[model samples]
Target: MHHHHHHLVPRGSILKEVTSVVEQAWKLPESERKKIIRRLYLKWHPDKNPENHDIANEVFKHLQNEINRLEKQAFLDQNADRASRRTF
Candidate 1:
């Protein structure tokens, strides 16, 4: 009775999945998250994906943008205190 089929498949940017992982990492402490983020970047490095270079290019760009935001919002604590306004 729960079978409500959609007319379209759920396909979108690769970030659809990448952003999901990124959102989950927000709660992690700095040292932990930074290390993982580096791994993610390396995981999607263009050199590692010549056949899928298009996806790698987009994913890595978004990952770098996230790094910039993280640097701007640098200085979190064990509490994960809210950064409040995006006072950029």
Candidate 2:
């Protein structure tokens, strides 16, 4: 996939199951999401937990990908437009 966005969640960065994590996180309110992300960052801070780089990276990538996927899905659902390409 070609992404115009510069930021990307690298593949295979996470060891934990990302699908469930994404679903749980998606159910959270925006404020909750922020808090969880922040707290989780501290707990899984790359600086603090350099030894667990693989797991930490996985968590970060999962959240990034999950958010993007959810946002795109939500847009398609709300627009009532179903197509392979959802420009809106």
Candidate 3:
């Protein structure tokens, strides 16, 4: 009954799960997105996970990719808003 303290480790569909959380939440605001990103980034750091580094690195890479993509989406939306507002 000690099935605890091990859920955070990247397992099957683990990283993918977060992927959806991010893509789906890319609306209204990105506050929680950044929160999850940093938490996951640290949670999956290879150094912190010891032998789980391989999978953790994979998770980290995926997280990084998501961050890059989300940043672009937010940036474009910002510009798009400004463009719409300054429509003179």
Candidate 4:
């Protein structure tokens, strides 16, 4: 059996760039972070860049996932704080 995953995206410069974008987004305010992600998603959507669609699709999915995860976590944390305050 052979692995086709390696052919899809090599672990190199592109991957590093993606990682850097994620890190920078994390440091930004939620609104700004989400705006940037949306912009990048549009810029890299597979339909727009078929030549590198695979990589673009992966990056887009990751940004969406990270945004969803961070927002949900913030919501949960806010609720937890509310509950603690009510109990206090």
Candidate with the greatest lDDT versus the true structure: 1
TM-score of each: 0.60, 0.45, 0.60, 0.56
Q: Which tens-of-lDDT digit does each residue in 12-79 have in candidate 2?
A: 54434555555666666688865654665576566778597776776767566666677668556645
On lDDT, the stronger of 3 and 4 is 3
Pairs that clash in candidate 1: none
Displacement of residue 8 (Cα, Å) in model 2 is 25
What is the C-alpha local distance difference test score of candidate 1? 0.75
Root-mean-square deviation per candidate: 6.3, 10.5, 10.1, 7.6
Error of 4 at 82 (Å): 10
User: What is the alpha-carbon lDDT of model 3 when measured against the actual structure?
Assistant: 0.72
Whole-model lDDT, model 2: 0.63
Q: Kindly report which residue stretches of model 3 are placed more than 4 angstroms away from their true locations once superposed.
A: 1-11, 24-31, 78-88
Clashes of each: 0, 2, 0, 0
Candidate 3 lDDT by residue in tens digits, 4-83: 56646555778668778767656536577567666767878888896996887877777788888778767766343553
Ranking by lDDT: 1, 3, 4, 2
1-88 in candidate 1: lDDT tens per residue? 7987866443475667777877677778888877778788889998987687877787788889987777666655454556564557
